[PDB]
Amino acid sequence: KVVSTDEYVARTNIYYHAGTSRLLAVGHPYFPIKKPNNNKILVPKVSGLQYRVFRIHLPDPNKFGFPDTSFYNPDTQRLVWACVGVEVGRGQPLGVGISGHPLLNKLDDTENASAYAANAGVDNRECISMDYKQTQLCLIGCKPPIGEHWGKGSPCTNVAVNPGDCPPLELINTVIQDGDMVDTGFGAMDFTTLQANKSEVPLDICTSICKYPDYIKMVSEPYGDSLFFYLRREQMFVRHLFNRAGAVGDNVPDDLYIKGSGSTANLASSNYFPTPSGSMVTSDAQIFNKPYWLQRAQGHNNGICWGNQLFVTVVDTTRSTNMSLCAAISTSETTYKNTNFKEYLRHGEEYDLQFIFQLCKITLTADVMTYIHSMNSTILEDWPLKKYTFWEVNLKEKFSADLDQFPLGRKFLLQA
Amino acid sequence: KVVSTDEYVARTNIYYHAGTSRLLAVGHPYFPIKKPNNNKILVPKVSGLQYRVFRIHLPDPNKFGFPDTSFYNPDTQRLVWACVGVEVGRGQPLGVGISGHPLLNKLDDTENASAYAANAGVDNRECISMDYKQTQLCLIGCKPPIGEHWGKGSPCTNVAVNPGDCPPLELINTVIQDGDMVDTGFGAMDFTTLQANKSEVPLDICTSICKYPDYIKMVSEPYGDSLFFYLRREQMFVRHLFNRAGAVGDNVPDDLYIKGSGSTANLASSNYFPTPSGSMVTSDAQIFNKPYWLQRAQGHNNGICWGNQLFVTVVDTTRSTNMSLCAAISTSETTYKNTNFKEYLRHGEEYDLQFIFQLCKITLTADVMTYIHSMNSTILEDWPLKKYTFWEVNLKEKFSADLDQFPLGRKFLLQA
Amino acid sequence: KVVSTDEYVARTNIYYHAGTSRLLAVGHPYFPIKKPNNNKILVPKVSGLQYRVFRIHLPDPNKFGFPDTSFYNPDTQRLVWACVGVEVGRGQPLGVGISGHPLLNKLDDTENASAYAANAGVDNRECISMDYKQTQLCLIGCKPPIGEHWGKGSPCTNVAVNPGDCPPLELINTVIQDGDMVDTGFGAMDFTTLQANKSEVPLDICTSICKYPDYIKMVSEPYGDSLFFYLRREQMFVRHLFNRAGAVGDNVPDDLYIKGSGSTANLASSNYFPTPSGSMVTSDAQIFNKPYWLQRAQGHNNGICWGNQLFVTVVDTTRSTNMSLCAAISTSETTYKNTNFKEYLRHGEEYDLQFIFQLCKITLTADVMTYIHSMNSTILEDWPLKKYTFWEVNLKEKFSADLDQFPLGRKFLLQA
Amino acid sequence: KVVSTDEYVARTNIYYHAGTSRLLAVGHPYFPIKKPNNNKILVPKVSGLQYRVFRIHLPDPNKFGFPDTSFYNPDTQRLVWACVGVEVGRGQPLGVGISGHPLLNKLDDTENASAYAANAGVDNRECISMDYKQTQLCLIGCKPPIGEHWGKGSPCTNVAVNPGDCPPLELINTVIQDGDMVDTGFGAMDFTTLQANKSEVPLDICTSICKYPDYIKMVSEPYGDSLFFYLRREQMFVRHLFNRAGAVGDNVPDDLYIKGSGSTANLASSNYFPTPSGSMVTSDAQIFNKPYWLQRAQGHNNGICWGNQLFVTVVDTTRSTNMSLCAAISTSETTYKNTNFKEYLRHGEEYDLQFIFQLCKITLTADVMTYIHSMNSTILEDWPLKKYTFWEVNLKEKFSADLDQFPLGRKFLLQA
C-alpha cells in the first residue's frame, strides 16, 4: 500500500530562493552544420519545436550550512527539499516559424480540380513549405518524462515477407531527452524507419522521431514521482489538401465505384494528406511568465525532490521566428547580381528559471525505513541516467534566505 | 405509473473502483483489407468517425465475495450496482483527418463563374477530398443506444413505378452498434440504397449508413434506462460550392426564369451541394479526460445497472490523423523513381475507461415484486443482444475497495 | 540590503493634477524628406510603428510655492513627488497601415506549387507589400527603458575570415529612444549590419534596428526604478510563404533526401520566410483612453519620481492609417493622363497625457542619508542623458490643486 | 470655478414620457438624383454611413399646463427638464452594403507578384468595389457635436509654390450636421481639396469630408454640456494590398536599395494602400434597441436640457443593405436582352426614439443668477444654429404622465 508523503514528512518554516541568470541557445533551425572532412559539429541544431528538458541539481541539505541547527536532531532526523513555487521566464518576441522540403512528395491539389491526371511521370516532387501546429506545455517532476510513439514491430515467422510490404506497427514508450522533436501535425511516429523515400515530411523531422507525452501512464504511476504539475495547450487546422505519388500498396475494392473510360480509365491516388496550420499567437493565451504555486499535487508525492534532483520539461512554439542573414562576397559592383550574396538562417532562444524551496525533515523509524527502502533503495544509501542527454542546471551555489530581494519571492510573500 | 428508483432502492456506503488498462485499435481508415481468393479480413477498418460502443459486464453482487455480510439479509434483500462516476481517458495527439473520392461526381465550381457550360460529356468525375465536420459525444446507459436515419419506403400499389423515379423517403430508428458511421456533413441517410452511381460521397461512407442519435425518443422513454448522461458538441462550415452531373429528374418551372440564347440556350445543373469543413481543434474545447459525477439523472432511473450491464457510446473526431507509410521495393538505385516505392495509410486509436460504483440493496415485497416484474421480467428470473456487435469489456476481475490507490478514486474522495 | 520606499518616505494628503493640451506629429511614414544639395530635414519620419518616449520634467517641490508650509520642517525635511494615476489620451480613428519594398527578395510562392524552378536568373526581385503584426504597450518609470536586439560579435582570431561568411551573433542591451522601431514580425535584429543586399525587409526597417523591451532584466533590477507599471498586448499570424534568391551558404546534408533527375537535378532554395499579418483592430481590445491607478508597484520603488523626472513609453499600431494626397500639375486637360498628377503619402498622430501627483516628505537622518547616497549620489547634491533623444514635456507651469476641474480628477475623487 | 448642477438644481418626483412614432428615409445610396435642366433634387442621398443628428424641441415647462401648481412658487422658482432615460429603436434586418468606383486608381496587386511592371501607360484605372469598416456610435447632449478632420493650411509666403507640390496639412474642428460622412477606413480628411484626380476613393466619399468625433475636446469642456452620454464600437481588417499610378512626388533615397537592370531598371510605385473590411454583423454585438439610464454624467452637467433642447447623434452601419430594382422597357420579347431592362439602387432606413424626462426647479438668488448669467446669457433672457441642418423633432405635443402605458415606462417603473 502506498501512502501520501504528508504522513511521514514534516515541513518546517524555512524557505529559500533559487534561480538561473539567463540561458541562451543560437543555432540552425533545420540541420546541424558540420565540417566536410571531420564529424565534429560547428553549429548545433536549435529549433522552436524541440523538447527542452532541464535537469536541476540541488545542494544536499544534510551537508548544507545553516545558521541554525537546533530545529532538528541529526541522530534521528534527515532533511530534504520540497518545491513550492516555479516560474519559467521566457524572452524574445512572439513569432511564427515555417519549414518545408525542396523535394516533397506532392502529386496534385485535390481541394478543387477540373482535369484528370491520366499520365504518370518519373519524378513529381515539389518545393513545399508550411507552418506547424501551435503547442505549449510545461511538466515538473523529480524523474525524467515518458513519451510514446509508433514504431515497427516484430513480424510473425509463419510466412515470409516480400520487399515493399507494409511494416507492422506498435506503440513504444521511451524517455524524453533534450533536443527531441514534438508533434507537428503529422503524428507521433518514427519517420526514419516507417518512411523509405525520405520525401514525405519536412527536413527537420524527416529523419527524427516525434514523441507525445504519456499522460495516462504518468498519472497512473503508484508513487507519482514523474509528474507533480503540468500544463498543456495545443491547436491546429487544415490549410491544403493534396495527393501522394508512388505505387499503390492496397487496391480500392471493385464494389466501391463504377469504372470509367478515356481519361478516367485508371484511378488517381487515394493517399490524401492535409497541411497543418497553427492559427495565431496572442499575448492573452500565454502560459509562461506566470508563477505556479504547488499547493497540492494530484499523486501521492507532494513536491518532495528525492535525491536532490528536479526535472523541468518545456515546449513553446509561440516564439519561433527564424532570422535571415546575408553576406556580401564582393562589394565592387553597383548592379545587383544573385551570385554576389550568400544567405543563412539562424534561430536564437532565451530562458530563465526561478524556484522557491521549503526545508523538510523525516524521522527514520523502522517502519519508515522499510517503506522508503521498498520505495527506492538508493535514498537510504545516499544518506543510472548516464545514457541520456539533458540541459544541466547547477544551483548548488545559488540559494539565498533573503526572499524579498527577488521578483518571485515578493510574490510568494504577497500571496501569504 | 412509473416511480423513481430512489423510493424502492436503498444505497449503502460501500464504493468500488473499476478500470481497463489500455485499449488499442490499428487499421485502415477507408476500407478493410481482404485476401483476393478468400473472404477473411486481414486488416480491419479503423476510422476516426466511427461509433465506439462498449458493452461492460459486471460481477453479480449476490455471488460476489464481500469481507462483511451482516449489512443485508439474503432472505429478503437483493443487491445491485449503481454508477456514481465515469472517466474516459483518451490518448494520442490532436489532429484532423481528410477523406475523398477518386471519381466523385462534380461538374463545376459555382461560387464564382465566368463562362457557361454549354456542352455535355460522358464522364466528368473528379478526384476530390475534404475534411468533415467536428463532433464529440458521450452517452452512458444500461441499454444500447438508438439512432435514426433516412431510408426507402414502401410505395403505393395504385400506380406502377418506372426506372429512374425518385425513391420514397421515411425515417427509421435502429440500434447503434460498434463500427457504425457518424454524420459527416451530408445528412443521416442510407447511401447504398438512395444513391445508385456510387460516386456522390467519399469512399468511407459511399456504401454505409450514417446515423444520428435519437435524443427526443431516448429522453421520452417512461423508464429512462437508455440514457443516464450525455454530452455533445458539434460544428461545421462551408468551404466549396459545386454542381452535379447527370440527367435532370425534375425540370425547373417555366415561370421562374427567362429563356436565353446562344451559350445559354439550355440550362445548367441546379443540384448544388456544399463541401463541409470542421474548423479547428483546441485543447480548451475538449470534453474528454475529465471526470463526470452522476449526482441526479434526468429520467426516473438514477444510475442503477440492471442485469449487471453498462453501455458507453463515444464519438471523437478531434484525434483523426492518418499516418502515411512507405516501403522500398528495390534499394539498389541512386536516383528516385515513383515505381520503386509503395504507399500505405494507417490509423491507430487509444482508449481508457474508469468507473466508481456504489452497492445498493432492494427489499422484495409483493408490491415491489409486481412493479419490477412489470418493468422487466428477466430481472426476477436472473435473481437478446446476440445479433449486435459491441466492443466487449470484462470487469468481473477488476474491482478493488482501495479507492485512493487510483487517480479517479483520489478525485472522488477529494470532492467529498 | 534594499528596503521599500514605504519605510523612509512619508505621504501627505495633498494632490495635484498635471496635463498636456495636445501633441501632434505629421510626417512621411517611410523615410525623411531631405533637400538634395543640403542635409537639413524638411519633412521628418512619422510612423505608426515607432517608439514614443516622453521625458517629463516636474517642478522642484522644495522651491515650489505652496499656500501652506507648516506641514513640514525645512530644517530636517525634504519633499518629493509621487505618481498615483496616469491617463494616455489617444486621438484619431482606428486603422491599419501597410508597408513594402519595390525590390524585395522573393523567389517563389511555396505554399502551393506545380512546376519546378530549374533555371536561375540575374535579378528576381519583386514589388511586395504587407501589413505588420499588432502591438500595444505602455511603460511608466523614472529611468529610460532598456531594449534588446541581435547584433554582430567579435570573432576569434585563431582563423581568418573569408568574404561571404556568416556573421557571428550576440545579444545587445541598449536604451530605447524616441523614434526607434518596434518589432514587426521579422525579429529583433540590426538589419543594417546583418543584411548586405538591402532587399530583404520593407523600406522603413531595412536600415534600422528593431528592439524588444527587456522585461526580465527590468524587473530583476534591485531598486526597481526603471519600471513602475507596464501593459502589453501583441498578436500576429502568417499570410504567405515564400523563398529567397541568392547563393547557398550552407548545403543540405546528403542523407536527408534522394537525388532527382531532369527538372529536379538541382535543389531549390530552402531559405523559407513567412509574411506576417496583424489580424483585426477592435474597440474592445484597446488599452488606451483608460485611467491607470498605481496602488502598489511590483518593485521596491512605489512611484517616487527621484530627481523630478518621469519617463513614459508608448507603442500603438492600432491607429496607423496613411493618407494619400494628390496634386495636379496642369488643369487645362479634359482627359485623364497619369503624368498630370503627383502622389504623396502622409501620417499624422495625436497624443494627450494627464497625471495625478501626491506630495511626500523624507526625514534625513544619518542612516537615511547613507542609504540614499549609496542608492544614488546625485539626489543629495541636487537637494548624463545628453546623448539620447526624447520627446520633452515641460509641466513646470501646469499644476492646479483644483482637482475636480479636470476629467481625470473627477474619476480620482470618485474612486475614493 | 464651475460647480455641479446637483447643487443649485432641485429635482421633483414628476416624470413624463415622450416618443416619436416612426421615422423613414428612402433614397439613393451614392449620389442625389437631380433633374438635368433644373437644380432641384428629386431623390435625396440616403446612405448607411451618414451621421444622423436629431435636434429635439421640448415644451417650455413654465408655460406648460400642469394639473397641480402648488409644488413651486412662480415668484422665485423656474422650471427645467432633465433627461433620465433614452431608447433608440432601430428597424430593418441586419445587412452589409458595399461601394466602389468605376475608375478607381489601382495599378497592381502587391500581395503576391511574379512579374515586374516595366512599362507605363496613359490610363490604368479599374472598376473596384469593397465593403467599409464596421461602426456603431450614439451621443447624447444639449449642444451639437464636434468633429475633427485633416484639411489644407496656409503656406508661408517666404518661398513660392509650384504646381504639383504637396498641400500643407492641419487639423480642423467643426460641428457635425445631419448627412455628414463617417470614416470608412481611409482616414478623416477632406477628399475634395486634398485629392485632385477624383479617382482615389469610392463615389460616395470622393467629394465629401469624413469627420471623427472629438472625444478629448468634448470631455475637457468646463461645463460638459456637449456630452452627457456616449457609446462607440468599431472594427476593421485588411483584405487587399494595391499600388497607385501617377508621377512620383518624392523619390526613394539612393541608400535604401541596390539598383537593378533589365526589367528592374526603374522602380515601381511605393504608394501602397490597403482595402478595408468590416468583418461580420451579429445580434449579440448590437448597442441599439436597449434602454440607457442616465444616473450620473461624467461632466458637471447631469442631464439638464437648458433652453428646452436636446441633441442625439447616431451612426449605425450594421443595417446597410442596398436594394436592387429592375424595370422592363418592353415586355413583348420572349428572349432575354440586356437592353430591355433598367437597373436602380435604393436604400431605406427606419428610426424610433423614446425618452423619459424629469421636472426640476431652480431658485433664482443673486449668486445663482450671476453664475447662470456667466455660464450662458440667453437662459435668463428666455425666462445661432440657423446655418446648420439637423433632423428636427417636435415633441411639444407628445407628453403623457401615464408612464406605464408605454414600453419604456414599464421598464423605468420596473427598475425602481
GROMACS .gro file of N, CA, C and O in nm, chain B residues 207-270:
model
  256
  623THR      N    1  -2.099   0.340  -4.915
  623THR     CA    2  -2.174   0.216  -4.906
  623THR      C    3  -2.215   0.187  -4.762
  623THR      O    4  -2.225   0.070  -4.722
  624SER      N    5  -2.239   0.291  -4.683
  624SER     CA    6  -2.269   0.277  -4.541
  624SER      C    7  -2.392   0.360  -4.506
  624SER      O    8  -2.446   0.434  -4.588
  625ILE      N    9  -2.436   0.346  -4.381
  625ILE     CA   10  -2.545   0.425  -4.325
  625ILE      C   11  -2.487   0.518  -4.220
  625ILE      O   12  -2.414   0.474  -4.131
  626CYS      N   13  -2.520   0.646  -4.230
  626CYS     CA   14  -2.486   0.744  -4.128
  626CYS      C   15  -2.607   0.763  -4.038
  626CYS      O   16  -2.718   0.790  -4.086
  627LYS      N   17  -2.586   0.749  -3.907
  627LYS     CA   18  -2.694   0.756  -3.810
  627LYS      C   19  -2.670   0.871  -3.712
  627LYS      O   20  -2.556   0.904  -3.679
  628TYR      N   21  -2.780   0.931  -3.667
  628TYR     CA   22  -2.778   1.036  -3.568
  628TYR      C   23  -2.853   0.988  -3.443
  628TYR      O   24  -2.956   0.922  -3.455
  629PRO      N   25  -2.802   1.018  -3.323
  629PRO     CA   26  -2.871   0.974  -3.202
  629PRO      C   27  -3.011   1.035  -3.192
  629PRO      O   28  -3.033   1.151  -3.225
  630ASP      N   29  -3.105   0.953  -3.144
  630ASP     CA   30  -3.244   0.996  -3.128
  630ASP      C   31  -3.264   1.043  -2.984
  630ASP      O   32  -3.314   0.971  -2.898
  631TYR      N   33  -3.221   1.167  -2.958
  631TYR     CA   34  -3.231   1.222  -2.823
  631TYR      C   35  -3.376   1.237  -2.778
  631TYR      O   36  -3.409   1.207  -2.663
  632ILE      N   37  -3.463   1.284  -2.868
  632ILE     CA   38  -3.602   1.311  -2.831
  632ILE      C   39  -3.672   1.182  -2.791
  632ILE      O   40  -3.748   1.179  -2.693
  633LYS      N   41  -3.649   1.074  -2.865
  633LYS     CA   42  -3.711   0.947  -2.831
  633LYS      C   43  -3.647   0.884  -2.708
  633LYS      O   44  -3.716   0.819  -2.629
  634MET      N   45  -3.516   0.903  -2.690
  634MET     CA   46  -3.446   0.848  -2.575
  634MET      C   47  -3.490   0.913  -2.444
  634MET      O   48  -3.504   0.843  -2.343
  635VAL      N   49  -3.511   1.045  -2.443
  635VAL     CA   50  -3.549   1.112  -2.319
  635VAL      C   51  -3.697   1.097  -2.288
  635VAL      O   52  -3.737   1.119  -2.173
  636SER      N   53  -3.778   1.059  -2.386
  636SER     CA   54  -3.921   1.040  -2.366
  636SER      C   55  -3.957   0.899  -2.322
  636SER      O   56  -4.075   0.869  -2.305
  637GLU      N   57  -3.858   0.812  -2.305
  637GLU     CA   58  -3.885   0.677  -2.259
  637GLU      C   59  -3.937   0.680  -2.115
  637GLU      O   60  -3.881   0.751  -2.031
  638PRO      N   61  -4.043   0.605  -2.085
  638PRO     CA   62  -4.102   0.614  -1.949
  638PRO      C   63  -4.006   0.577  -1.838
  638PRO      O   64  -4.009   0.639  -1.731
  639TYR      N   65  -3.920   0.477  -1.858
  639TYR     CA   66  -3.831   0.431  -1.752
  639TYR      C   67  -3.694   0.498  -1.754
  639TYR      O   68  -3.627   0.500  -1.650
  640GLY      N   69  -3.652   0.551  -1.868
  640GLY     CA   70  -3.524   0.620  -1.876
  640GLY      C   71  -3.403   0.533  -1.852
  640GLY      O   72  -3.307   0.577  -1.787
  641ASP      N   73  -3.405   0.410  -1.904
  641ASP     CA   74  -3.292   0.319  -1.889
  641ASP      C   75  -3.185   0.337  -1.996
  641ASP      O   76  -3.070   0.302  -1.972
  642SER      N   77  -3.221   0.392  -2.111
  642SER     CA   78  -3.128   0.401  -2.223
  642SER      C   79  -3.037   0.523  -2.216
  642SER      O   80  -2.948   0.535  -2.301
  643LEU      N   81  -3.055   0.611  -2.119
  643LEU     CA   82  -2.975   0.733  -2.112
  643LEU      C   83  -2.972   0.784  -1.969
  643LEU      O   84  -3.074   0.835  -1.919
  644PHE      N   85  -2.858   0.770  -1.902
  644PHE     CA   86  -2.834   0.835  -1.774
  644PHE      C   87  -2.767   0.971  -1.788
  644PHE      O   88  -2.793   1.061  -1.707
  645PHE      N   89  -2.681   0.987  -1.888
  645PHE     CA   90  -2.596   1.104  -1.900
  645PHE      C   91  -2.549   1.114  -2.045
  645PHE      O   92  -2.524   1.011  -2.109
  646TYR      N   93  -2.536   1.237  -2.094
  646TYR     CA   94  -2.490   1.256  -2.231
  646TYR      C   95  -2.430   1.396  -2.247
  646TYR      O   96  -2.477   1.492  -2.186
  647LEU      N   97  -2.325   1.404  -2.329
  647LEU     CA   98  -2.265   1.530  -2.372
  647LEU      C   99  -2.245   1.527  -2.522
  647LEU      O  100  -2.214   1.423  -2.580
  648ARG      N  101  -2.263   1.643  -2.586
  648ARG     CA  102  -2.247   1.656  -2.730
  648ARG      C  103  -2.188   1.792  -2.763
  648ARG      O  104  -2.209   1.889  -2.690
  649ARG      N  105  -2.114   1.798  -2.873
  649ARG     CA  106  -2.058   1.924  -2.921
  649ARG      C  107  -2.018   1.907  -3.067
  649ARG      O  108  -1.929   1.827  -3.097
  650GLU      N  109  -2.079   1.984  -3.157
  650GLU     CA  110  -2.054   1.970  -3.300
  650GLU      C  111  -2.052   2.106  -3.368
  650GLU      O  112  -2.116   2.202  -3.323
  651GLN      N  113  -1.977   2.115  -3.478
  651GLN     CA  114  -1.960   2.240  -3.551
  651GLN      C  115  -1.911   2.212  -3.693
  651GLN      O  116  -1.844   2.111  -3.718
  652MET      N  117  -1.945   2.303  -3.785
  652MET     CA  118  -1.905   2.292  -3.925
  652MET      C  119  -1.930   2.424  -3.997
  652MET      O  120  -2.003   2.510  -3.948
  653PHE      N  121  -1.868   2.438  -4.114
  653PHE     CA  122  -1.898   2.547  -4.206
  653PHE      C  123  -1.876   2.498  -4.349
  653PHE      O  124  -1.842   2.382  -4.372
  654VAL      N  125  -1.896   2.588  -4.445
  654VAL     CA  126  -1.897   2.556  -4.587
  654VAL      C  127  -1.769   2.609  -4.652
  654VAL      O  128  -1.736   2.727  -4.635
  655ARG      N  129  -1.699   2.524  -4.727
  655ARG     CA  130  -1.578   2.565  -4.796
  655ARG      C  131  -1.597   2.584  -4.946
  655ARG      O  132  -1.546   2.682  -5.002
  656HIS      N  133  -1.667   2.493  -5.013
  656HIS     CA  134  -1.678   2.498  -5.158
  656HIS      C  135  -1.823   2.475  -5.200
  656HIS      O  136  -1.900   2.412  -5.129
  657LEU      N  137  -1.857   2.527  -5.318
  657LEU     CA  138  -1.991   2.516  -5.374
  657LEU      C  139  -1.978   2.462  -5.516
  657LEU      O  140  -1.913   2.525  -5.600
  658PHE      N  141  -2.041   2.348  -5.543
  658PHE     CA  142  -2.024   2.278  -5.670
  658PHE      C  143  -2.160   2.245  -5.731
  658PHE      O  144  -2.266   2.272  -5.673
  659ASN      N  145  -2.156   2.186  -5.850
  659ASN     CA  146  -2.269   2.127  -5.921
  659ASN      C  147  -2.257   1.975  -5.923
  659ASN      O  148  -2.159   1.916  -5.876
  660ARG      N  149  -2.358   1.911  -5.980
  660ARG     CA  150  -2.358   1.768  -6.006
  660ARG      C  151  -2.392   1.744  -6.153
  660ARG      O  152  -2.459   1.825  -6.216
  661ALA      N  153  -2.343   1.632  -6.206
  661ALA     CA  154  -2.364   1.595  -6.345
  661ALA      C  155  -2.456   1.474  -6.353
  661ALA      O  156  -2.448   1.383  -6.271
  662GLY      N  157  -2.543   1.475  -6.453
  662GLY     CA  158  -2.638   1.367  -6.471
  662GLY      C  159  -2.758   1.417  -6.549
  662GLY      O  160  -2.757   1.526  -6.606
  663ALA      N  161  -2.861   1.333  -6.552
  663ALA     CA  162  -2.988   1.372  -6.612
  663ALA      C  163  -3.074   1.443  -6.509
  663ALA      O  164  -3.063   1.419  -6.388
  664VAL      N  165  -3.160   1.532  -6.557
  664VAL     CA  166  -3.242   1.616  -6.471
  664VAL      C  167  -3.370   1.540  -6.436
  664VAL      O  168  -3.451   1.510  -6.524
  665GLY      N  169  -3.386   1.508  -6.307
  665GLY     CA  170  -3.506   1.438  -6.264
  665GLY      C  171  -3.630   1.524  -6.268
  665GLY      O  172  -3.736   1.480  -6.314
  666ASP      N  173  -3.620   1.648  -6.220
  666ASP     CA  174  -3.733   1.741  -6.214
  666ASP      C  175  -3.694   1.871  -6.282
  666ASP      O  176  -3.593   1.932  -6.246
  667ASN      N  177  -3.774   1.914  -6.379
  667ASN     CA  178  -3.745   2.035  -6.455
  667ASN      C  179  -3.782   2.160  -6.376
  667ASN      O  180  -3.879   2.161  -6.298
  668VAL      N  181  -3.705   2.265  -6.396
  668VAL     CA  182  -3.737   2.395  -6.336
  668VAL      C  183  -3.863   2.450  -6.401
  668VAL      O  184  -3.877   2.443  -6.524
  669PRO      N  185  -3.958   2.503  -6.323
  669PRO     CA  186  -4.079   2.560  -6.384
  669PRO      C  187  -4.047   2.677  -6.475
  669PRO      O  188  -3.952   2.753  -6.452
  670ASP      N  189  -4.127   2.691  -6.581
  670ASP     CA  190  -4.101   2.790  -6.684
  670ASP      C  191  -4.129   2.933  -6.638
  670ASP      O  192  -4.091   3.027  -6.710
  671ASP      N  193  -4.192   2.952  -6.523
  671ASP     CA  194  -4.227   3.084  -6.474
  671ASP      C  195  -4.126   3.139  -6.374
  671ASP      O  196  -4.156   3.239  -6.307
  672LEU      N  197  -4.009   3.077  -6.362
  672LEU     CA  198  -3.906   3.123  -6.270
  672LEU      C  199  -3.786   3.185  -6.341
  672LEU      O  200  -3.693   3.230  -6.273
  673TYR      N  201  -3.786   3.190  -6.473
  673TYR     CA  202  -3.671   3.242  -6.547
  673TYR      C  203  -3.716   3.284  -6.686
  673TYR      O  204  -3.826   3.251  -6.730
  674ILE      N  205  -3.629   3.358  -6.754
  674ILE     CA  206  -3.649   3.399  -6.893
  674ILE      C  207  -3.546   3.326  -6.978
  674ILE      O  208  -3.427   3.325  -6.945
  675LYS      N  209  -3.592   3.264  -7.086
  675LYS     CA  210  -3.507   3.179  -7.168
  675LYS      C  211  -3.398   3.260  -7.238
  675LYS      O  212  -3.421   3.373  -7.282
  676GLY      N  213  -3.280   3.200  -7.249
  676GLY     CA  214  -3.167   3.262  -7.316
  676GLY      C  215  -3.145   3.208  -7.456
  676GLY      O  216  -3.227   3.136  -7.513
  677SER      N  217  -3.031   3.246  -7.513
  677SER     CA  218  -2.996   3.208  -7.649
  677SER      C  219  -2.845   3.200  -7.662
  677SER      O  220  -2.771   3.262  -7.586
  678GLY      N  221  -2.800   3.122  -7.760
  678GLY     CA  222  -2.658   3.104  -7.783
  678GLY      C  223  -2.595   3.006  -7.688
  678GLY      O  224  -2.623   2.886  -7.693
  679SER      N  225  -2.507   3.055  -7.600
  679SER     CA  226  -2.446   2.969  -7.499
  679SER      C  227  -2.546   2.930  -7.391
  679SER      O  228  -2.534   2.822  -7.333
  680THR      N  229  -2.643   3.016  -7.363
  680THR     CA  230  -2.741   2.994  -7.257
  680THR      C  231  -2.874   2.941  -7.311
  680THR      O  232  -2.979   2.965  -7.251
  681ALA      N  233  -2.871   2.870  -7.424
  681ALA     CA  234  -2.994   2.814  -7.479
  681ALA      C  235  -3.052   2.707  -7.386
  681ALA      O  236  -3.174   2.698  -7.370
  682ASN      N  237  -2.966   2.626  -7.326
  682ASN     CA  238  -3.005   2.525  -7.229
  682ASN      C  239  -2.962   2.567  -7.090
  682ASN      O  240  -2.881   2.659  -7.073
  683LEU      N  241  -3.016   2.499  -6.989
  683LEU     CA  242  -2.992   2.534  -6.850
  683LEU      C  243  -2.884   2.444  -6.790
  683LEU      O  244  -2.873   2.326  -6.823
  684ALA      N  245  -2.805   2.503  -6.700
  684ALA     CA  246  -2.705   2.428  -6.626
  684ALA      C  247  -2.769   2.359  -6.505
  684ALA      O  248  -2.886   2.380  -6.473
  685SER      N  249  -2.689   2.277  -6.438
  685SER     CA  250  -2.740   2.196  -6.328
  685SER      C  251  -2.780   2.283  -6.209
  685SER      O  252  -2.711   2.379  -6.174
  686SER      N  253  -2.892   2.248  -6.146
  686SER     CA  254  -2.940   2.313  -6.025
  686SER      C  255  -2.930   2.223  -5.903
  686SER      O  256  -2.995   2.249  -5.801
   0.00000   0.00000   0.00000
